[PDB]
Amino acid sequence: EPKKYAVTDDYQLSKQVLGLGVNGKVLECFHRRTGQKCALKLLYDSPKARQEVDHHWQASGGPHIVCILDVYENMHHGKRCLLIIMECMEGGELFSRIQERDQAFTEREAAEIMRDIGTAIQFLHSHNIAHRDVKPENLLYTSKEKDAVLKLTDFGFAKETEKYDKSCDMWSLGVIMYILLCGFPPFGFPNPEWSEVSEDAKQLIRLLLKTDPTERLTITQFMNHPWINQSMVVPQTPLHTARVLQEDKDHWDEVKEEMTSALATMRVDYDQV
Ligand SMILES: O=C1NCCc2[nH]c(-c3ccnc(-c4cnc5ccccc5c4)c3)cc21
């Protein structure tokens, strides 16, 4: 299953960094014989690294999941490492693409995005995998083109399960959906940004952002909600999202940082009350 020969036999590596995960850095690379641009995640070997490889491998091929192409077990700097070769997500991050629109971003488009993310979580939860770190850095597009596909990645905190772990994914969906609809995170629905958002959308968010994890919707309830299930019928209402993301771009790193912190807090064995 994992290739034991040198990854450089098959791939020409670059030093262009494409992203950073808890277990390793993500580099650009090129398949030596097809020329296809790909992404290489370098994981120094460990049980956590073996878990990530195992979980991403099982999830690879599922809807809206970044696909693994190859996995290599190599020696690097005298250390045993695992190299995950993934499809190159040349469209970049979800919210950067929205930010780079001027053009109308509609509530229907947010509903289609959320349905895509929910489809990925639905696949994972039906295979007893909870992601536990769904966040802007992990939501990527296959290309900069209009027909790009949104996919989830990074299984470094994934866990084979537990209703609590799955409810942390559902909380992530509510946070992402909140930002999708107004351009700032929930950490009420203030006017003017939320003035014209439908009642279905605000109802779904409140059901996902319950403080009590047992009160949060499951992914099945999420996918059956009319805002998701009937996402095509969702009003084409133009949102403030792109404009707000541009206006607040200097604070975007802080938004990502506190979401990362909130997600890590949900993963601790024992937390304060
Ligand atoms: O596992 C991860 N944890 C943290 C972030 C991340 N990005 C990736 C990743 C994977 C594949 N392609 C990319 C990628 C992202 N952004 C790009 C922008 C422009 C060109 C290529 C890009 C590739 C990123 C994986 C991970």
Numbering used by the authors: 33 to 133, 135 to 194, 217 to 242, 264 to 349
Text of the article:
When building atomic models into weak and/or low-resolution density, a common strategy is to restrain their conformation to that of a higher resolution model of the same or similar sequence. When doing so, it is important to avoid over-restraining to the reference model in the face of disagreement with the experimental data. Here, two new such potentials are described: a Cartesian distance restraint derived from a recent generalization of common loss functions and a periodic torsion restraint based on a renormalization of the von Mises distribution. Further, their implementation as user-adjustable/switchable restraints in ISOLDE is described and their use in some real-world examples is demonstrated.
Manual checking and (where necessary) rebuilding of the reference model is often advisable, particularly for older models; in many cases the output from automatic rebuilding and re-refinement by PDB-REDO may be a better starting point than that downloaded directly from the wwPDB.
